[PDB]
């Protein structure tokens, strides 16, 4: 067994690793390589990205998931991690370099992963792409720090075409212009009675194939394991028989006379592609640019890269509801299948025969396509997604017609996905309009009508509406026959026409303009991260990238699924019966409280209990009862699945949801909120009045890196690896949860991949979980909660509903305001975000005892609800930018005269709104998306305007130690802040170099630990950086004052000089200092944006074109940390806005929105493609430090500018459905299904004239 | 792999990049490139999958050699027989020139003979092996380094490396023994652990052999001395003339000899009538290297056996020549009496005599030696002290190196008795270069006291914090006040340091009897 990674071979003893160990197993735990990440652990996210490079007689590198791609089919392979590209010592690769200097790494946690994407694309492309393909390829790349731009900015300077600034400290690629795969003879068996063969003919296949089916073992024809990525691989499988090494499996035939091409079954995706775009000028085959495009709309590049079109159809066959987009197109174009039973035994059968019949023992050949010529046969196929890429349909489809001479149907083929399992083809539809003109007069109101009525859709959650879907497949339909209209030069109603096209999205770019000092320097210079080469290489180290300690076990939950029941038997032994599972606890197990929280507790945190393992009535569906430790982390999580719990009783009612709870309205409610109030009296006159509601839902915070502890037992205490935002609340919870003592419980956390809250507190239940184990069973112990653990059994951001009535002038000014909100808190009333709400509910609007304000906060049977981004800040701005925007609705009066009528007096507001509307030439663009809206049905223009008035406060305090090295004058930071990817070391760095008088070079910052971090506060509220700023200048300033008097007497000519004559001196160079609430004095940060969007009325997919952002950053410490923090910033609330939803099974309460599969947040091409953020100039802070603003959270809050904009977009559709003028409640999300359903849309609407 | 000094990104040489007169005056290869100046000087290293492959291999390295020293002088004696006592060679430097160039007597004498002490290289035997593990780490190092002195080992690496010293970063939680023998000889192993870490860019251990150790590391300086001594007839001392040599090894660096001539003079009383003349010899050695009380083990063992000698040419008992030579109203003349009556050593020295006279072949001996040691504070030693809110317990990590002398038993007992909390309560964490920044190497015997001095003061400053809080809060316990404390946001982490001045020097005054049995036929 012989694998080859980064130049270095690797000799593979089979026998002892598991029968289906990943190569992301293999790369991190065996060749000890921790570059490469994970995360999902399912094709989605791409962390764990890397190439492999294999034997025309040519080198091939592409793109794989690792945590997917089976290790027993890489033998022979040569895998390339970040780590394989460069390194300190022997300089960075070019692309690692491009990422960090040009400011596209925050956390990190994607860039190896980012890194290797890029590699993959060039080689494969022999180093010639286009700006277009880079910003094709990554789909598979999930970033939650940088809003992807600097990414996309970095990637595309690689282009032939390349428009980038490159700094010109950036070295130039090597020439990428253009090892042979082990294929061992007969099989490897396994311990546990699994075996692997590695047939190289198809003899060999099926002598390994009839082997396994008379032994009776389950088998697998493994190519590219993605399957396993949308319905896991059963554990029962014994049988491996590689397949991506037959040649007869590959390849193509066109047929002599061009009349069929025969496709090689286990082809790849991205080997079909680029089999189209070879075949797509030859006469016939003209319709594979449209196979190509619905590829190009399949999962994503190394997904496609490793997936078969055997084995997507194989999952179809398997799981007749899985709308494949495979399956649709072959569908659509009556594809044969080849179906081989033996070596010289097969049949070609339609592609319904081959899903019909029995596959046990046979295997896919091949594809059989026929020639389509372009005028006779019109092909065409949608896949309709709630994001740009790599999500799966709420309705995909394939249309193909025949047309005879006179323009008439000879036959059509309209098939649909994602309406119901049994359902293909549109058969009434396809033998309506047989024999007919489809264009003569009444044939498509026929048409609609008829489909309309014949698709029922079924309701299987988390799947979109019935009602969505079908008016989905509808408009599909109606796309088509308006898109081949416009082909053929059918007469067509302007108003109809774009109807047809799908939405523009040029190449994304991006504008920044800042401000900088000199005199200031190092602060206010623009620079790359403190930590950017070491997060690009891989070299840079997370928690889990601690090495192999000898006798690790990894943990999972075991969880509860039964709310209000209690669990009275738990029965381990089938988890037990694996052979290396080695142990369940439970709360009996623990020595201490069965408490998550500090020894004293307060009343914003922790005034509520919080259980460990749960001991009594169940209290949401994934609360955890305990945890298996098993010698794998495949192994934890399967066997934590197979512990059996016994229930005794259960709620009759169980209220997972907001809307769940305040339908039934009470114990849940409580109200921290009571307005001074009681009636509003309203003495004022008012034009107009108007109620209202506004809905926004969880959001998950989607930290690439997962909830991770490692502990160690050392020296009779513990060593605690956690990522943690609060180092010492971690500690605290573990010292009283075992009885042990804090000095005996040591926490590191260098850096985390981030946690924009959700590591604050959530980081505990598996830290504690951890150390429990590592406590009792005397051993190290790894908690990597799985992705589907996370989203099951912690909390979100809190959900907020509000109802309101506003009275206000015919001008917009505003009369009077009376609004009740509501946040789910879910099952405990703890870390309530209700006051930062009520904080921001004026934003800059002037009141006058003419404001009613009411909250609650709201129990639901659902995990405990936690901090996120801007917690309350966010929903109180949301909350009065709404009303604002209702009142203009109302009003008719433009949304920027309703904000004039009401701005507070004498305020910054007033100064930055006329220059930012002047600027973004705002009333003339929102004059055009009007006029352009008066033309067109279909496609619809909005504009959006937010802004902001957000507060900064401190709180807690934050230590720093600092040290200069005698032996060059270099300096050493160990804080108490955690760096989750804000830049924290980067401004710390630039501080300490600025007051020592030294280059940032010469400062490390190292790990935080729970000795130079002792009793730190947690790292929040965007103020976090400034704070251990203020405490790093403080312990500087102290340095400098022991410096003074030996400058002034050996008066040095350098720095080297004058720190060894202070060491001969006996100078102590260490000074630890601190900064506390009160040492600066809070502010508040005025921030603009407005959106532009396209609306495609009858898909509901929309794209978001110019967003422009001015924000106060004060005189920015780092114009590039503060750049890539509101662009961060405004695409999480961009996520919030548009794809993100979170749901809940309404009758057993399970989060079912758990994985990359089913939860979407922003990609690449989901940013909006011309972004322009300004830092305002000339405005330096009077408060805070150092003149500037933080920037962490308050853009967040602008992103509702992008619902504002698709609100115009809807409504313009509505006024065209000759809807009533009626205000449609926003919602985070506004997904296409949302806009849809509310857009007054109705197939009796399609018409052509 | 094989490394040598083509290898070397940096300079070939273990130290600092800042040298002074006493560590570092002479150049010191890591990789030895021209002549062999001893044999067992490292050439290079042999990098393999397990600790006996690594030294197996390291034996089946061939080396062609070309010429060859006339005459191989590895010894004291060899270098002394060969050249002769008088510096007029470059092997004999003459550091300790007397102010008297003859002796002349102002007193008259009885008794005068000539002697001579002699004492070889001692091996420290420190029961870890020379050992330094090197992590590659974020384009850094991470150095497990056996050391008393963590920032030679960073400046050494970082140097040779031409590395940042902010990015080599070194811990040692505590050594197996040093006494001496970790201060400087460690970096050999540590600098070609490093090297290979960084070059091969994977994990070194580097675990040295005892033979590897003993063959080419070096050990206590050996000692000979030649003395002229002129006394009355009640051993009272009119004069001595003492000649001494100290074996350096091949280089001339960590000269114990200052300590020999600071204790020559033991706690006697001389009159400008005491000549002493020392010299440095180099020998084709390892170089040697500070052990267990550098040049005071000399200083003593010289006047001590002058004082035996003296006894023995009188016939005056030893204790009594002792006496006729003590400095007036010193501890000693106080300690001395007190310790001969308790331990009963007049009657114990006649039974002895009396035991000799009866047999021939079983013969007793009791042996006396009093000293003077003199303690001197060297250097600065940080320390960091912080109290956990959660439940008072107490962290300290500090610039000493604890050797088995007990340094954090008495730093512990120091912070809880300034704190006022029990020493259960305090934990001594890891020393590193984070918190240890730029600290001496621990020696001298002062290392426990100037860490207690440091860590005592963080602890004061502590305090000082914490009076307002007790004052106002009246708190009934310490867990109280700490909470209170955590509450106003009072730092509970306090650095500080001990630094040369901070304390006084003194001497240490000690008597020693010893009684011993001798089979004259075996020895
Ligand atoms: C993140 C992600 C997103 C995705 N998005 C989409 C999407 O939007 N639309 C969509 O349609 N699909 C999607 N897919 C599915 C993807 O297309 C398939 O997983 C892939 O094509 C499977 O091929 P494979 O080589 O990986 O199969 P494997 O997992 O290796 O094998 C799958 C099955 O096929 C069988 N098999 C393999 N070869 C043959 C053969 N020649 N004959 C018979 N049986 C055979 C095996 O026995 C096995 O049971 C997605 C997958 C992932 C991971
Ligand atoms: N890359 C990155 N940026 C981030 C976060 C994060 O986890 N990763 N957290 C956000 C949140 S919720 C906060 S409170 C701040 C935390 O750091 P700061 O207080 O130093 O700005 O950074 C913000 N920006
Ligand atoms: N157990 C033990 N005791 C020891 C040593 C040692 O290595 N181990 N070194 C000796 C030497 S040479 C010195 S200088 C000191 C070092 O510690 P101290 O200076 O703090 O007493 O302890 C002495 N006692
Ligand atoms: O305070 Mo930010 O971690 S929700
Ligand atoms: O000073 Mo002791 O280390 S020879
Ligand atoms: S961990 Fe492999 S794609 Fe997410
Ligand atoms: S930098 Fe991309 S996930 Fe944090």
Request: proline fraction near 5%.
């Amino acid at each position: 067994g012989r694998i080859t990674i980064n130049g270095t071979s690797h000799e593979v003893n089979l026998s002892a690793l598991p029968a289906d160990i990943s190569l992301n197993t293999f790369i991190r735990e065996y060749a000890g390589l921790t570059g490469t990440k994970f995360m999902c652990q399912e094709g989605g996210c791409g962390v764990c990205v890397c190439t492999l490079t294999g034997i025309t007689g040519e080198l091939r590198t592409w793109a794989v998931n690792s945590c997917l791609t089976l290790l027993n089919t890489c033998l022979g392979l040569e895998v390339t991690t970040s780590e394989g590209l460069g390194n300190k010592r022997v300089g960075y690769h070019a692309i690692q370099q491009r990422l960090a200097k040009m400011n596209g790494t925050q956390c990190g946690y994607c860039s190896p992963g980012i890194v290797m994407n890029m590699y993959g694309l060039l080689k494969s492309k022999g180093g010639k792409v286009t700006m277009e393909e880079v910003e094709n390829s990554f789909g598979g790349n999930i970033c939650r720090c940088t809003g992807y731009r600097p990414i996309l900015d970095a990637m595309k300077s690689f282009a032939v075409d390349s428009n980038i600034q490159v700094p010109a400290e950036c070295i130039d690629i090597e020439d990428l212009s253009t090892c042979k795969k082990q294929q061992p003879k007969g099989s490897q068996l396994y311990p546990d009675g699994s075996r692997w063969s590695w047939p190289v003919s198809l003899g060999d296949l099926f002598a390994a194939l009839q082997g396994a089916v008379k032994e009776k073992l389950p088998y697998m024809l493994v190519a590219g394991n993605t399957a396993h990525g949308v319905y896991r691989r059963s554990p029962d499988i014994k049988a491996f028989i590689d397949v991506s090494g037959l040649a007869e499996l590959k390849g193509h035939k066109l047929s002599a006379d061009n009349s069929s091409l025969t496709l090689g079954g286990n082809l790849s995706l991205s080997e079909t592609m680029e089999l189209c775009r070879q075949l797509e000028n030859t006469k016939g085959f003209e319709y594979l640019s449209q196979v190509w495009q619905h590829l190009d709309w399949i999962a994503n590049v190394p997904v496609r890269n490793a997936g078969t079109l055997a084995g997507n159809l194989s999952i179809k066959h398997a799981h007749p509801e899985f709308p494949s987009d495979v399956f649709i197109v072959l569908e659509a174009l009556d594809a044969q299948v080849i179906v081989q039973e033996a070596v010289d035994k097969q049949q070609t059968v339609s592609l319904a025969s081959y899903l019909g019949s029995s596959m046990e023992g046979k295997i896919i050949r091949g594809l059989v396509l026929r020639a389509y010529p372009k005028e006779r046969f019109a092909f065409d196929s949608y896949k309709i997604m709630p994001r740009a890429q790599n999500a799966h349909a709420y309705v995909n489809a394939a249309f193909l017609v025949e047309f005879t001479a006179d323009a008439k149907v000879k036959s059509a083929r309209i098939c649909f996905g994602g309406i119901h399992p049994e359902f293909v083809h549109a058969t009434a539809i396809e033998n309506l309009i047989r024999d007919k003109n489809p264009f003569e007069n009444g044939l498509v109101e026929k048409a609609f009508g008829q489909l309309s009525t014949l698709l029922q859709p079924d309701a299987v959650l988390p799947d979109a509406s019935p009602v969505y879907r079908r008016k989905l497949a509808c408009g599909l339909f109606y796309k088509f026959l308006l898109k081949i209209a416009a082909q053929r030069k059918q007469g067509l109603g302007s108003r109809f026409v774009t109807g047809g096209s799908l939405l523009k999205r040029p190449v994304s770019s991006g504008q920044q303009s800042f401000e900088t000092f000199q005199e200031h320097y190092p602060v206010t210079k623009a620079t790359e991260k403190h930590e950017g080469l070491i997060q690009c290489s891989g070299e840079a180290t997370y928690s889990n990238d601690l090495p192999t300690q000898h006798n690790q076990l990894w943990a999972a939950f075991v969880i509860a699924k039964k709310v209000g029941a209690k669990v009275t038997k738990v029965d381990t032994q089938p988890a037990l019966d694996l052979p290396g599972v080695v142990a369940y606890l439970d709360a009996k197990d623990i020595p201490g409280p069965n408490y998550v929280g500090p020894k004293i507790r307060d009343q914003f945190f922790f005034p509520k209990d919080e259980e460990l393992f749960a001991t009594g009535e169940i209290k949401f569906y994934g609360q955890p009862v305990g945890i298996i430790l098993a010698n794998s982390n495949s192994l934890a999580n399967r066997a934590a699945e197979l512990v059996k719990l016994t229930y005794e009783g259960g709620a009759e009612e169980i209220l997972p949801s907001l809307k769940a709870v305040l339908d039934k309205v009470n114990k849940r409610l409580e109200q921290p909120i009571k307005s001074t109030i009681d009636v509003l009296q309203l003495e004022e006159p008012f034009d107009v009045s108007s109620s209202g509601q506004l809905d926004m839902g969880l959001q998950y915070h989607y930290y690439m890196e997962p909830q991770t502890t490692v502990v160690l037992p050392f020296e009779g205490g513990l060593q605690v690896y956690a990522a943690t935002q609060w180092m010492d609340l971690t500690q605290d919870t573990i010292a009283n949860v075992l009885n042990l003592k804090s000095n005996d419980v040591q926490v590191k956390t260098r850096r985390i991949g981030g946690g924009y809250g959700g590591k604050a507190t959530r980081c505990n239940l598996a830290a504690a979980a951890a150390a429990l184990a590592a406590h009792k069973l005397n051993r190290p112990i790894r908690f990597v909660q799985s992705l589907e653990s996370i989203m099951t059994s912690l909390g979100k951001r809190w959900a907020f509903h509000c109802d309101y009535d506003f009275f206000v002038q015919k001008s917009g000014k505003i009369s009077g305001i009376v609004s009740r909100f509501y946040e789910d808190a879910g099952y405990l009333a703890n870390e309530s975000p209700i006051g930062h709400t009520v904080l921001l509910s004026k934003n800059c609007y002037e009141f006058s005892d003419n404001y009613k304000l009411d909250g609650y906060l709201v129990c639901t049977d659902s995990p405990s609800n936690t901090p996120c981004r801007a917690p309350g800040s966010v929903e109180g701005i949301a909350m009065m930018e709404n009303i604002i925007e209702h009142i203009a609705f109302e009003t008719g009066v433009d949304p920027a005269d309703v904000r004039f009528a009401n701005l507070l007096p004498a305020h910054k507001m007033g100064d930055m709104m006329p220059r930012f509307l002047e600027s973004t030439k705002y009333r003339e663009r929102k004059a055009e998306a009007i006029a352009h809206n008066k033309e067109n049905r279909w496609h619809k223009r909005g504009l959006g305007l937010c802004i902001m008035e957000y507060q900064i406060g401190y709180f807690g305090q934050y230590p720093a130690t600092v040290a200069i090295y005698h032996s060059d004058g270099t300096v050493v930071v160990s804080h108490g802040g955690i760096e989750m990817g804000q830049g924290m070391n980067t401004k710390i760095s630039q501080v300490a170099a600025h007051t020592l008088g030294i280059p940032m070079e010469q400062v490390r910052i190292e790990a935080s630990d729970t000795i130079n971090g002792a009793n730190s506060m947690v790292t929040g509220g965007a103020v976090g950086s400034e704070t251990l700023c203020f405490a790093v200048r403080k312990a500087c300033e102290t340095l400098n004052e022991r410096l003074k008097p030996v400058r002034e007497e050996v008066k040095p000519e350098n720095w080297q000089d004058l720190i060894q004559e202070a060491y001969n001196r006996k100078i102590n160079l260490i000074a630890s200092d601190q900064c506390k609430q009160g040492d600066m004095d809070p502010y508040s940060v005025c921030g603009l944006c407005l959106t532009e969007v396209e609306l495609d009325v009858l898909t509901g997919n929309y794209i978001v074109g110019r967003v422009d952002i001015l924000e106060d950053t004060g005189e920015s410490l780092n114009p590039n940390v503060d750049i890539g923090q509101i662009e961060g910033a405004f695409m999480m609330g961009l996520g919030y806005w548009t794809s993100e939803q979170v749901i809940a099974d309404p009758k057993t309460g399970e989060c079912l929105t758990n994985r990359t599969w089913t939860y979407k947040p922003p990609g690449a091409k989901d940013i909006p493609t011309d972004l322009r953020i300004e830092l305002l100039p000339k405005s330096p802070n009077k408060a805070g430090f150092m003149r500037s603003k933080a920037t962490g959270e308050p853009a967040i809050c602008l992103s509702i500018a992008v619902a504002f904009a698709l609100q115009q977009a809807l409504q313009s559709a509505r006024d065209d459905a000759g809807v009533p003028k009626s205000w449609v409640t926003l919602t985070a999300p506004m997904t296409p299904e949302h806009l849809v359903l509310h857009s007054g849309t109705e197939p009796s609407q399609f018409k052509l004239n | 792999a094989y490394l040598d000094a083509k290898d070397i990104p940096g300079p070939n040489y273990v130290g600092p990049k800042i040298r002074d007169q006493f560590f570092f005056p002479k150049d010191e290869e890591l990789f030895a490139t021209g002549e062999i100046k001893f044999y067992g000087q490292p050439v290079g290293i042999i990098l393999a999958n397990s600790n006996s492959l690594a030294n197996r291999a390291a034996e089946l390295v061939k080396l062609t050699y070309e010429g060859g020293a006339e005459e191989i002088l590895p010894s004291l004696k060899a270098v002394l027989d060969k050249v002769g006592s008088e510096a007029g060679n470059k092997r004999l430097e003459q550091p300790i020139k007397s102010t008297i160039d003859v002796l002349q007597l102002e007193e008259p004498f009885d008794v005068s003979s000539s002697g001579q002490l002699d004492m070889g290289l001692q091996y420290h035997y420190y029961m870890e092996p020379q050992t330094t593990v090197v992590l590659p780490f974020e384009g850094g190092l991470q150095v497990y380094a056996a050391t008393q002195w963590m920032d030679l080992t960073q400046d050494t690496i970082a140097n040779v490396l031409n590395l940042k010293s902010n990015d080599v970063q070194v811990k040692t939680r505590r050594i197996g023994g040093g006494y001496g023998g970790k201060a400087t000889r460690c970096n050999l192993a540590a600098a070609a652990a490093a090297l290979a870490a960084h070059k091969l860019n994977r994990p070194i251990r580097f675990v040295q052999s005892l033979e590897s150790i003993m063959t080419s590391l070096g050990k206590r300086w050996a000692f000979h001395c030649d003395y002229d001594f002129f006394v009355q007839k009640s051993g009272k001392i009119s004069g001595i003339v003492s000649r001494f040599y100290e074996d350096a090894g091949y280089l001339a660096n960590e000269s114990p000899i200052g300590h020999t001539v600071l204790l020559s003079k033991n706690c006697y009383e001389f009159s400008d009538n005491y000549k002493l003349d020392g010299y440095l010899v180099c020998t084709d050695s390892p170089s040697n290297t500070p052990c267990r009380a550098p040049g005071s083990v000399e200083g003593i063992a010289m006047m001590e056996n002058i004082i035996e000698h003296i006894a023995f040419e009188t016939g005056v008992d030893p204790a009594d020549v002792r006496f006729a030579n003590l400095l007036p109203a010193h501890k000693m003349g106080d300690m001395m009496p007190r310790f001969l009556e308790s331990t009963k050593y007049r009657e114990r020295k006649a039974e002895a005599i009396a035991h000799n006279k009866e047999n021939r072949w079983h013969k007793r001996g009791l042996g006396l030696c009093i000293m003077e040691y003199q303690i001197g504070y060297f250097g600065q030693y940080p320390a960091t002290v912080a109290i956990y809110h959660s439940d008072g317990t107490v962290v300290v990590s500090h610039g000493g190196i604890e050797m088995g002398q007990g340094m954090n038993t008495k730093i512990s007992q120091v912070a809880a008795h300034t704190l006022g909390i029990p020493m259960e309560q305090v934990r001594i964490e890891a020393s590193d270069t984070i918190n240890g920044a730029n600290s001496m190497v621990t020696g001298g015997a002062v290392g426990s006291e100037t860490l207690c001095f440091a860590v005592r003061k963080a602890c004061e400053t502590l305090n000082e914090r914490l009076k307002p809080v007790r004052e106002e809060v009246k708190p009934e316990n310490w867990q109280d006040l700490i909470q209170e404390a955590y509450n106003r946001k009072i730092n509970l982490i306090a650095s500080d340091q001990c630094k040369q001045g901070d304390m006084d020097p003194y001497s240490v005054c000690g008597l020693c009897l010893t009684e011993v049995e001798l089979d004259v036929l075996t020895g």
